[PDB]
């Protein structure tokens, strides 16, 4: 129904600078991660290189924002890249040179924005492109982000509000942006979902003339706005910021369950970025510092398995150049990636005693089953073929291990350690 | 496995005794409505004859309950039909004779039940079939319905709880019940959604060996439980009790918008019963008494048109034998019903200035467009073919009037009075 | 002091209550034994109420955990009655009169717990109401229960006969000689909030019954939003949910006292709940414990007594009195401390900072009382200046619990206090007095 | 008894406030004209505060609707200052000292409105805080705004300098001669609830400034949960959101008085808000009205005065005084009625039933005051027994507004009262 669905026919795959560099990534870091993606990941689908929040804040140095500071901005109230961090942006070029470089690697370019219009623009009353009202005249008088001071909300009832958002996506299209992650929009402790700005952004993107995939943040996303999200966004965060802590991974199981009927071509509920590999380099969030992910290998596989079968977008959050062989292997298993790319219909078959099973299928007769022990004790997790809707015996294969398991006549059953999972393909017997 | 979806491949259509007779319908009134349906309505899909709440309360005489009164019940804590109101239930036969009669007319039989176990069973500690525990041992000590005194909630953690629900659906299956409307389960001012009982009921149905369509009430249904409802129920009420008042009809537009992505084969968000024809005979609800519906003809058409394109179940709430020719005409237009039976993908194309357009399609390429003026002022309501996704000129037909309208080149546009609508079919031009 | 019933509780009620020791299950013999102990060791210090707590009408009660949907003992007018197995003197329809007589003969007063409403078994049978032709069924609220007890349904004040039922209850209680009623499921409720209309019906029933009956309301937390209602209708009302011998609950009470201090006055006492001292949990499993001596340390026990004393909470001892040791009894028989509860007024939090708190009050003879508390986890000096107390000159100081003169204080009071430890001090004039 | 600042408001403050007539936009000449009126006609009856309401620091203010995000008049120490265009005597950095001097010379007292916090522009420019090496930006809360005005950010009491900033504000206000401050965005907030920590900083700043400054808090509804806090820190606090000349809001006040009546006492006055009487809405558009005489009927006006009087709310006239008619003035100059406000105590609701309400209070000479109200839509007799008043014998009765003896009353007071009409009666011992 919505043309923009065609811009994300499978769930977006890429890298995002937040978990490794907070608000502070530099051009060289972005390029290095892009070069890695081009070389090792791109043939497996990984394509977006996304500069996360506050690329317009020259003094950013962490995940903790420096409040009330000046921001780089053009003459039409539009935030611009900090030239110290992004030297190719010198001379008002913005992100075009960086985006060109990324496109020349065969990749796509993404940016984070904060909902609204900068506070400094509203206080100074700087101009808006394409109208003779000033920034001050389109601001909401009662709309802020509770955890960041950069912006005020834009009031869609005001003349010039749509013009401002149109002008942002003109700029981003000029730069060659392919993806935008809009933040302080899905959930807010003070205000709830900013629905009207979502609609203004949808319209701005549709007018700018370029395919720009729309990601919305942060969660938890209310189901009450399911129709709005499904129709307007290509991806939307189910949860608040995800980190390498078991408790947050445990919690994702329920959110997937809650959102599974709204997953479909072009509109992807988002389990958030993958905190794998080397993270916390200039981020202090998640209760950690400079580290390798604190998820155990079992937890890492559990996460990948759930995000894969659910069909979350996959946005790697570590510094890619520091990946070891293990970490790279989580990204490049063709059999596993078939479930994400070509599976559909994912659903929770059951959840009982902290054992969970999910299943999906492809168009070729295969059924995929992800079985999870999300308890604190080792245990056998099982599911009958009848509960999967398989009426005959099936061949089983462990997709992560790439290992035939033989014929299964009645049930699948595996001993799984705490937080451990397995992903199995069932197919018709020979 | 959602095998129960197959029991409601299209949204259930039928008649329900609440709006005309409150809690107090008699066997004769049910039979008469069933005979009418067999004769005039069955070829158009109308098939369920549903006895609404409190068939077990011999003194019921209104929509206002008589609180704390004795209820008709068997020896296993199961409510039974009141023999004074349902004479064929003499001798412990329950509803089997009535259901047989209804089946012999080529129709299906439905009943209303209240969640839980009767308070009188708990207080007397009457037995539960198939166990040695008593009613008192399975009751929740803190679960009531705030607007009816008949039951206490059942506690799924107690031994015997599932046995009790299993026993209910064994009885209903013995009677030949094809449809159950379970109340005090979706929403509750005191407790929210009774999720655990929904699951016990799903299980009891699945175990009883007969196809029984599951309807849940009352709304508003939380979007947060969309997965649970979609997987467990065939229909669930979006709203608190719907009545012949413009305000409630106006409000339904938003609920349909909220629920539209969860509508699909086997699982139907429910806009509630149609307060058409002669209602309020022994009901005082909705702010009215014995009357013909207070919806104007335009309003009645507006309602039918929205429920049709949305694919709400259609449960007629008036005393059918008092239909006039106008009222019957709302129920026997095959061209309109096709949109309900075979349409899919219904969505709100836009809502602006209290003008609303919805569209859906069938697999044969027809596009259906419902255009609504829900404002207080006459106006032209229009929509471009482009916004419908039609890339060239089309022919249009008014489905209610059964009248070709000719070619449309750029936009559909009609003058519509306040609260008036039209339903149009678009197909390729010659 | 507009309301006549204020005169029935000029000082905050003091007594004993069966809940913390015996749950819902106390017997006549236990009640009498605690009364006898009170008469002989406590009565000269103001302890006078002997309160039979919840479910004296439930013959099979055996714990603090209620046995749901069981038969209850009741008369022919929908009124609950004492279980005769547990209260043998109630045989022959006499109810509590004999037990109350016995208590009155000791020079004490008698109290009972009731649950708001009318028994569900009355409403379902539709049993009669004294003094009217409507039945129990016709006065019940169709949407009013207690979420943690199944005995009753609420009564709907709009229905004819509702007031007659409550009047009839207090006619019964007056006939028995009841001097005190603790009405439960009325102040707070997870489902419904405060049952204001029933509070008013009960005020009226009491006023009509012709006997002075002190009205206690339970359970908390009491909303400040209903401060006026509570102040004008009740003699005491619970500030908190059930209090037990856990430091965390005692720590929390400091804030609730702060919140309620301006509504404390003659006849109308915010209630910090019963004192879980001595031997408790005999047939109670609440509070996370079983049969035990209170888990409060001695310091905690003093800290509790000190706050309740200066605050002017009602004092309802919750342990089985006959098992008191010397230490426990000493908490109850210090006249110098009790003077602060009986004759103090104006109690206020002077400050709270770094988990140090100081409260002060005074009497009409110009003595000033100061309670100082370390509610942190570390030993520390807690101090307060005379200026902050409003004392303009040097004062003599005395440690009321220790009964020990501390000498002259020129500028400030200051004491090293262990974690959870407190002190209660009296300040009186030095200028103008001999040496 | 305990708090020294109670002695600065031994009776409930009485005065005039510019909001209901001039919104945010009053001028020096308008203030001075109202003050002159007060001095001439009102001062002998207790009216003494002349209060300049919100946004005296916003030079372009022109209504009750704020002009968001505009630059504000401010000194080098992040402190808002009077707009010299509106207050010409403030020229040359003198602030409100000349105006306050003029007012004091009339035998009156001077009040100002402030918004909680520190100005956004000070935080963005990081202007200094007097007496310290920190800046405004170092003391601001990053998640604390007013939802209905854009001028300030909240101050974070945990930060070094925070107290110094509020101390500096009250040093300025004391230098000017301020005698009363109304602090807004502090009692209630849709986003954040009661700003309890800033109330305590303000209490402390006032206590340190060396001058008696009566502390009024706004806006309501004030939560009873914070009764202690308000009673101990403030001289008055708003029970309600902004009160206007609409029956519905007057009707609602009866319940708020009932809820707050036990916390009324010397020095600490729950506040039923300003009196929308006389000529209001001159440059205000709030309350659903424009330039007008109050839409309260005479009966409603009396009913309001009567409740505020017996309850002992502060009395802050909100109209342009110079346009009073003889009627309006009469509501302010009845000494017999005012005695109930000045010397009454113990006010309580005797009952409320069928939209009839009776309040009573007394004085120390044993007079008893009874206010009887018909707040229904129908004419009716409203009565109350002497027994319910606690009068154990017959009493003389006098209608205080009419100044008319009514004779001996043996058993009950009873009067036929129109809808929204009331009466105020004094009962005193017979012979």
Coordinates of N, CA and C in Angstrom, one line a residue, chain C residues 126-245:
Chain C
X126 N -30.1 -13.5 51.5 CA -31.1 -12.4 51.8 C -31.7 -12.6 53.1
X127 N -30.9 -12.6 54.2 CA -31.3 -12.5 55.5 C -31.8 -11.2 56.0
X128 N -32.6 -11.1 57.1 CA -33.1 -9.8 57.4 C -32.2 -8.8 58.0
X129 N -32.7 -7.6 58.1 CA -32.0 -6.5 58.8 C -32.9 -6.0 59.9
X130 N -32.4 -5.9 61.1 CA -33.2 -5.4 62.2 C -33.8 -4.0 61.9
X131 N -35.0 -3.9 62.2 CA -35.7 -2.6 62.2 C -36.2 -2.1 60.8
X132 N -36.2 -3.1 59.9 CA -36.7 -2.7 58.5 C -37.1 -4.0 57.9
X133 N -37.9 -3.8 56.8 CA -38.3 -5.0 56.0 C -37.5 -5.2 54.8
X134 N -36.5 -4.4 54.5 CA -35.6 -4.8 53.4 C -34.6 -5.8 53.9
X135 N -34.2 -6.7 53.0 CA -33.2 -7.7 53.3 C -31.8 -7.2 53.0
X136 N -30.9 -8.0 53.5 CA -29.5 -7.8 53.3 C -29.1 -7.6 51.8
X137 N -29.8 -8.4 51.0 CA -29.5 -8.3 49.6 C -29.8 -7.0 49.0
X138 N -30.8 -6.3 49.5 CA -31.2 -5.0 48.9 C -30.3 -3.9 49.3
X139 N -29.4 -4.0 50.3 CA -28.5 -2.9 50.7 C -27.1 -3.1 50.2
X140 N -26.8 -4.2 49.6 CA -25.4 -4.4 49.2 C -25.1 -3.6 48.0
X141 N -23.8 -3.1 47.9 CA -23.2 -2.6 46.8 C -22.9 -3.7 45.8
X142 N -23.3 -3.6 44.5 CA -23.0 -4.7 43.6 C -21.5 -4.7 43.1
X143 N -20.7 -3.7 43.4 CA -19.4 -3.6 43.0 C -18.5 -3.1 44.1
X144 N -18.4 -3.8 45.2 CA -17.6 -3.4 46.4 C -17.2 -4.6 47.2
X145 N -16.0 -5.0 47.1 CA -15.5 -6.0 47.9 C -14.2 -5.5 48.5
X146 N -13.6 -6.4 49.4 CA -12.3 -6.2 49.9 C -11.4 -7.1 49.1
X147 N -10.2 -6.6 48.6 CA -9.4 -7.4 47.8 C -8.7 -8.5 48.5
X148 N -8.6 -8.4 49.8 CA -7.7 -9.4 50.6 C -8.5 -10.2 51.6
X149 N -9.8 -10.1 51.6 CA -10.7 -10.8 52.5 C -12.1 -11.0 51.8
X150 N -12.6 -12.2 51.9 CA -13.9 -12.5 51.2 C -15.2 -12.5 52.0
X151 N -15.1 -11.9 53.3 CA -16.2 -12.1 54.2 C -17.4 -11.2 53.9
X152 N -17.2 -10.0 53.4 CA -18.3 -9.0 53.2 C -18.4 -8.5 51.8
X153 N -19.5 -7.8 51.6 CA -19.7 -6.9 50.5 C -20.0 -5.6 51.1
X154 N -19.6 -4.5 50.4 CA -19.9 -3.2 50.8 C -21.4 -3.0 50.9
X155 N -21.7 -2.0 51.7 CA -23.0 -1.5 51.8 C -23.2 -0.1 51.1
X156 N -24.3 0.0 50.4 CA -24.6 1.1 49.5 C -25.5 2.1 50.3
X157 N -24.9 3.2 50.6 CA -25.6 4.2 51.4 C -26.8 4.8 50.7
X158 N -26.9 4.6 49.4 CA -28.1 5.2 48.7 C -29.3 4.3 48.9
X159 N -29.1 3.1 49.4 CA -30.2 2.1 49.5 C -30.9 2.2 50.8
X160 N -32.2 2.1 50.8 CA -33.1 2.1 52.0 C -32.7 0.9 52.8
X161 N -32.5 1.1 54.0 CA -32.0 0.1 55.0 C -30.6 0.0 55.3
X162 N -29.8 0.8 54.5 CA -28.3 0.7 54.6 C -27.9 1.3 56.0
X163 N -28.4 2.4 56.3 CA -28.1 3.0 57.6 C -28.7 2.2 58.7
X164 N -29.8 1.6 58.5 CA -30.5 0.8 59.5 C -29.6 -0.4 59.9
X165 N -28.9 -0.9 58.8 CA -28.0 -2.0 59.1 C -26.9 -1.6 60.0
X166 N -26.2 -0.5 59.6 CA -25.1 -0.1 60.4 C -25.5 0.4 61.8
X167 N -26.6 1.0 61.9 CA -27.2 1.4 63.2 C -27.4 0.1 64.1
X168 N -27.9 -0.9 63.5 CA -28.1 -2.2 64.2 C -26.8 -2.8 64.6
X169 N -25.8 -2.6 63.9 CA -24.5 -3.2 64.3 C -24.1 -2.5 65.6
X170 N -24.1 -1.2 65.6 CA -23.6 -0.4 66.8 C -24.6 -0.5 68.0
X171 N -25.8 -0.8 67.7 CA -26.7 -1.2 68.8 C -26.3 -2.5 69.5
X172 N -25.9 -3.5 68.6 CA -25.4 -4.7 69.2 C -24.1 -4.5 70.0
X173 N -23.2 -3.7 69.4 CA -21.9 -3.5 70.0 C -22.0 -2.7 71.3
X174 N -22.9 -1.7 71.3 CA -23.2 -1.0 72.5 C -23.8 -1.9 73.6
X175 N -24.7 -2.8 73.3 CA -25.3 -3.8 74.2 C -24.2 -4.6 74.8
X176 N -23.2 -5.0 73.9 CA -22.1 -5.8 74.5 C -21.2 -5.0 75.4
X177 N -21.3 -3.7 75.4 CA -20.3 -2.9 76.1 C -19.0 -2.6 75.4
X178 N -19.0 -2.6 74.1 CA -17.8 -2.3 73.3 C -17.5 -0.8 73.5
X179 N -16.3 -0.5 73.7 CA -15.8 0.9 73.9 C -15.0 1.5 72.7
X180 N -14.6 0.6 71.7 CA -13.7 0.9 70.7 C -13.9 -0.1 69.5
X181 N -14.0 0.5 68.3 CA -14.1 -0.3 67.1 C -13.0 0.0 66.1
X182 N -12.3 -0.9 65.6 CA -11.4 -0.8 64.5 C -12.1 -1.3 63.3
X183 N -12.4 -0.4 62.4 CA -13.1 -0.7 61.1 C -12.0 -0.9 60.0
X184 N -12.0 -2.0 59.3 CA -11.0 -2.4 58.3 C -11.6 -2.3 56.9
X185 N -10.8 -2.4 55.9 CA -11.1 -2.3 54.5 C -11.9 -1.0 54.3
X186 N -11.4 0.0 54.9 CA -12.1 1.3 54.7 C -11.2 2.5 54.4
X187 N -10.0 2.5 54.8 CA -9.2 3.7 54.5 C -8.5 3.7 53.2
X188 N -8.0 2.5 52.8 CA -7.4 2.3 51.5 C -7.7 1.0 51.0
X189 N -7.7 0.8 49.7 CA -8.1 -0.4 49.0 C -7.5 -0.3 47.6
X190 N -6.7 -1.3 47.2 CA -6.2 -1.4 45.9 C -7.3 -1.2 44.8
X191 N -8.5 -1.7 45.0 CA -9.5 -1.6 44.0 C -10.3 -0.3 44.0
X192 N -10.5 0.2 45.2 CA -11.5 1.3 45.2 C -11.1 2.5 46.0
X193 N -9.9 2.6 46.6 CA -9.7 3.8 47.3 C -10.5 3.9 48.6
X194 N -10.6 5.1 49.2 CA -11.2 5.2 50.5 C -12.7 5.1 50.4
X195 N -13.3 4.3 51.3 CA -14.8 4.2 51.4 C -15.4 5.2 52.2
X196 N -15.5 6.4 51.7 CA -15.9 7.6 52.4 C -17.3 7.5 52.9
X197 N -18.2 7.0 52.1 CA -19.7 7.0 52.4 C -19.9 6.1 53.6
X198 N -19.3 5.0 53.7 CA -19.4 4.1 54.8 C -18.8 4.7 56.0
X199 N -17.7 5.5 55.9 CA -17.2 6.1 57.1 C -18.2 7.0 57.7
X200 N -18.9 7.7 56.9 CA -20.0 8.6 57.4 C -21.2 7.8 58.0
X201 N -21.5 6.7 57.4 CA -22.6 5.9 58.0 C -22.2 5.4 59.3
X202 N -21.0 5.0 59.4 CA -20.5 4.4 60.7 C -20.4 5.5 61.8
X203 N -20.0 6.7 61.4 CA -20.0 7.9 62.4 C -21.4 8.1 62.9
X204 N -22.3 8.1 62.0 CA -23.7 8.3 62.4 C -24.2 7.1 63.3
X205 N -23.9 5.9 62.9 CA -24.4 4.7 63.7 C -23.9 4.8 65.1
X206 N -22.6 5.2 65.2 CA -22.0 5.3 66.5 C -22.7 6.4 67.3
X207 N -22.9 7.5 66.7 CA -23.5 8.7 67.4 C -24.9 8.3 67.9
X208 N -25.6 7.4 67.2 CA -26.9 7.1 67.5 C -27.0 6.0 68.5
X209 N -26.0 5.2 68.8 CA -26.1 4.1 69.6 C -26.1 4.4 71.1
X210 N -25.8 5.6 71.4 CA -25.9 6.1 72.8 C -24.7 5.7 73.7
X211 N -23.7 5.0 73.2 CA -22.5 4.7 74.0 C -21.2 5.3 73.4
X212 N -20.3 5.8 74.1 CA -19.0 6.3 73.6 C -18.2 5.1 73.0
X213 N -18.0 5.2 71.7 CA -17.2 4.1 71.0 C -16.2 4.9 70.1
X214 N -14.9 4.7 70.5 CA -13.8 5.2 69.8 C -13.7 4.5 68.4
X215 N -13.6 5.3 67.4 CA -13.5 4.8 66.0 C -12.1 4.9 65.4
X216 N -11.6 3.7 65.2 CA -10.3 3.5 64.5 C -10.5 3.0 63.1
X217 N -9.8 3.5 62.1 CA -9.9 3.1 60.8 C -8.7 2.5 60.2
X218 N -8.8 1.5 59.4 CA -7.8 0.7 58.8 C -8.2 0.3 57.4
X219 N -7.2 -0.2 56.5 CA -5.7 -0.1 56.7 C -5.2 1.2 55.9
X220 N -4.0 1.5 56.1 CA -3.4 2.6 55.3 C -2.8 2.1 54.0
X221 N -2.2 2.9 53.2 CA -1.9 4.3 53.5 C -3.1 5.2 53.4
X222 N -3.3 6.1 54.4 CA -4.4 7.0 54.4 C -4.0 8.2 53.5
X223 N -4.9 8.5 52.6 CA -4.6 9.6 51.7 C -4.8 10.9 52.5
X224 N -3.8 11.8 52.3 CA -4.0 13.2 52.8 C -5.1 13.9 52.2
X225 N -5.4 13.5 51.0 CA -6.6 14.1 50.3 C -7.9 14.0 51.2
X226 N -8.0 13.0 52.1 CA -9.2 12.9 52.9 C -9.0 13.3 54.3
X227 N -7.9 14.1 54.5 CA -7.6 14.6 55.9 C -8.8 15.2 56.6
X228 N -9.6 16.0 56.0 CA -10.7 16.6 56.6 C -11.7 15.5 57.1
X229 N -12.0 14.6 56.2 CA -13.0 13.6 56.5 C -12.5 12.8 57.6
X230 N -11.2 12.4 57.6 CA -10.7 11.5 58.7 C -10.7 12.3 60.1
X231 N -10.3 13.6 60.0 CA -10.2 14.4 61.2 C -11.6 14.6 61.8
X232 N -12.6 14.8 61.0 CA -13.9 15.1 61.5 C -14.7 13.8 61.9
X233 N -14.4 12.6 61.4 CA -15.1 11.5 61.6 C -14.5 10.4 62.4
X234 N -13.2 10.3 62.5 CA -12.6 9.2 63.1 C -11.7 9.7 64.3
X235 N -11.5 8.8 65.3 CA -10.6 9.1 66.4 C -9.2 8.7 66.0
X236 N -9.0 7.7 65.2 CA -7.7 7.3 64.7 C -7.9 6.7 63.3
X237 N -6.8 6.9 62.5 CA -6.8 6.3 61.2 C -5.4 6.0 60.8
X238 N -5.2 4.8 60.2 CA -4.0 4.2 59.9 C -3.3 5.0 58.7
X239 N -2.0 5.4 59.0 CA -1.2 6.1 58.0 C -0.6 5.1 57.0
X240 N -0.4 3.9 57.4 CA 0.3 3.0 56.6 C -0.4 1.7 56.5
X241 N 0.0 0.9 55.5 CA -0.3 -0.5 55.5 C 0.3 -1.2 56.7
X242 N 0.0 -2.5 56.8 CA 0.3 -3.2 58.1 C 1.7 -3.0 58.5
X243 N 1.9 -2.6 59.7 CA 3.3 -2.4 60.2 C 3.8 -3.7 60.9
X244 N 5.0 -4.0 60.6 CA 5.7 -5.2 61.2 C 7.1 -4.9 61.6
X245 N 7.7 -5.8 62.3 CA 9.1 -5.7 62.8 C 10.1 -5.8 61.7

